Amino acid sequence: KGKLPPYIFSPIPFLGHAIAFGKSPIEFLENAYEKYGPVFSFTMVGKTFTYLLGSDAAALLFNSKNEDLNAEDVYSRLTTPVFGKGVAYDVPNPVFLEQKKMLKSGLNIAHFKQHVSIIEKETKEYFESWGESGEKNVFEALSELIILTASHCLHGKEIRSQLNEKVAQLYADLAGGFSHAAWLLPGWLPLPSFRRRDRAHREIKDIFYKAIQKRRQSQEKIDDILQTLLDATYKDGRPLTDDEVAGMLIGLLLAGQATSSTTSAWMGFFLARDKTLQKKCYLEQKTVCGENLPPLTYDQLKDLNLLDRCIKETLRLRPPIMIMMRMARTPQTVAGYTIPPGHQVCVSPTVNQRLKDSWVERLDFNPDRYLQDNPASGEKFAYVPFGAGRHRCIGENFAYVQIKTIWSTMLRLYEFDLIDGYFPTVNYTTMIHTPENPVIRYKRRS
Numbered sequence: 425k426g427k428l429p430p431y432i433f434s435p436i437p438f439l440g441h442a443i444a445f446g447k448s449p450i451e452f453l454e455n456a457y458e459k460y461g462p463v464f465s466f467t468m469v470g471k472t473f474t475y476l477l478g479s480d481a482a483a484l485l486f487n488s489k490n491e492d493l494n495a496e497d498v499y500s501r502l503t504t505p506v507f508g509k510g511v512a513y514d515v516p517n518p519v520f521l522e523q524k525k526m527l528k529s530g531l532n533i534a535h536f537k538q539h540v541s542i543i544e545k546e547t548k549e550y551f552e553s554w555g556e557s558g559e560k561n562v563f564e565a566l567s568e569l570i571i572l573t574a575s576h577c578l579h580g581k582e583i584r585s586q587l588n589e590k591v592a593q594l595y596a597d598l599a600g601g602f603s604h605a606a607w608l609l610p611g612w613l614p615l616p617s618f619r620r621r622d623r624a625h626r627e628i629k630d631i632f633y634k635a636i637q638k639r640r641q642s643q644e645k646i647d648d649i650l651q652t653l654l655d656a657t658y659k660d661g662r663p664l665t666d667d668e669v670a671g672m673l674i675g676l677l678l679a680g681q682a683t684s685s686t687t688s689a690w691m692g693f694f695l696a697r698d699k700t701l702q703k704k705c706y707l708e709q710k711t712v713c714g715e716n717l718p719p720l721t722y723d724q725l726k727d728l729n730l731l732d733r734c735i736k737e738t739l740r741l742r743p744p745i746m747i748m749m750r751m752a753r754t755p756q757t758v759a760g761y762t763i764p765p766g767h768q769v770c771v772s773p774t775v776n777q778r779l780k781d782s783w784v785e786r787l788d789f790n791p792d793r794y795l796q797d798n799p800a801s802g803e804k805f806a807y808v809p810f811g812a813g814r815h816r817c818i819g820e821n822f823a824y825v826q827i828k829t830i831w832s833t834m835l836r837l838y839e840f841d842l843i844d845g846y847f848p849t850v851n852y853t854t855m856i857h858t859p860e861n862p863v864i865r866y867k868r869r870s
């Protein structure tokens with residue numbers, strides 16, 4: 425009822441902080457935290473935004489019911505142009521919850537066991553074109569490759585065979601629609617995400633009419649994923665339209681690719697920058713898999729603990745998801761403040777995960793930080809790259825399978841280096857932080 429969180433003055437009448445935030449969001453929220461503490465509001469584009477920084481505040485959002493802090497109210501703008509109607513934030517949460525469970529069917533030890541071989545092969549195949557040595561763009565490569573690995577692993581061999589590396593460029597433009605601008609403005613501007621949704625939709629639509637050409641009198645007794653969707657029905661019983669199916673396959677692919685490819689690229693540069701550490705990851709491959717480095721198996725992954733912490737530290741310093749957003753529909757209180765209905769409520773993993781008074785040597789890439797007590801273990805919500813509560817990621821496990829496998833394979837192929845000391849800066853083009861000038865030097869390993 426009572427007290428609003430501290431408000432941050434802007435001299436710009438309706439825009440508010442839209443420009444400064446859009447240009448440098450992290451810097452902004454860090455500065456805001458030092459001056460206003462962990463809970464504050466500011467205006468952007470005639471709207472009020474309340475951020476919850478650090479673990480104790482962020483808990484309000486993470487522990488929230490969707491009825492009170494609503495996701496789709498914010499997210500539908502961003503994702504409905506990308507996935508299309510009928511799926512995700514374009515439907516009630518009870519429906520989206522049903523879809524979420526369909527997609528979880530593919531995600532268990534059974535499938536992961538097969539995934540590891542697919543991924544290792546796709547990777548090795550892909551990086552032939554790099555030959556023995558050079559200087560190349562590793563982010564473009566992983567973007568291409570992970571289209572292939574993700575579609576193969578999650579979507580099946582059939583779908584995979586109709587996709588190729590040109591589809592990465594569709595997906596860059598899909599992900600291009602996850603921008604400050606798209607977040608805050610009505611969709612009438614130079615977003616070509618719509619063209620790429622037209623294409624990615626068509627591409628995925630051929631595939632239904634392919635299984636459906638057989639679906640008539642050919643009932644598949646080969647286990648697939650598109651099959652699961654076509655075969656499945658909602659709680660109430662109704663079957664998914666060809667449109668629902670299609671959207672969910674676009675989303676599943678983006679899910680497997682967008683967050684993984686930026687993360688994978690960053691790890692590259694962190695390891696290229698710290699050579700001692702890259703060495704040990706290589707040695708770990710041998711210690712764990714044997715000096716003769718045979719093909720990778722799912723069961724080897726759980727023991728690649730250093731690489732595991734390298735992924736963890738990358739997601740700490742460069743999470744692919746910088747902020748999560750909800751719309752307050754009912755008043756809410758945190759830290760002695762009341763957030764009224766209408767506030768957009770936000771948390772930032774990026775910020776939480778380098779908080780000046782939580783994370784010692786906050787900006788250092790040190791994966792050994794997890795071998796002593798640290799906020800990821802000793803706080804509930806200081807480390808949240810995959811989120812928490814009712815909205816959290818179903819795909820963390822697959823994600824780690826893909827990135828470990830790709831980077832296990834890649835360390836076996838090459839030794840990586842920076843080019844004249846240059847460590848990529850952050851590119852805030854989109855709300856998925858990619859690295860600047862992501863060209864890595866590489867030569868043959870061993």
Ligand code: HEM
Nearest residue numbers: 679680683684745748809810811815816817818819822823
């Ligand atoms: C590094 C890889 C990934 C990261 C960092 C990541 C991160 C996240 C985060 C932070 C959320 C929370 C959204 C929110 O609270 O508003 C989320 C939700 C989700 N992610 Fe991911 N994700 C990744 C990979 C994947 C993969 C591979 C899949 C599917 C196979 C996937 C599917 C989902 C789904 C279905 C949700 C649920 C959204 C909701 O319930 O509102 N993600 N992810």
Ligand SMILES: CC(C)=CCC[C@@H](C)[C@H]1CC[C@@]2(C=O)C3=C(CC[C@]12C)[C@@]1(C)CC[C@H](O)C(C)(C)[C@@H]1CC3
Nearest residue numbers: 499507511512602671672675676679745747748855
């Ligand atoms: C159901 C199918 C159609 C899509 C399922 C995946 C979808 C729920 C996941 C995948 C992409 C995803 C998570 O990584 C993303 C977000 C939350 C949930 C999403 C849409 C969101 C929307 C969370 C908010 C972030 O700021 C940002 C806009 C970058 C991402 C975009 C990607």
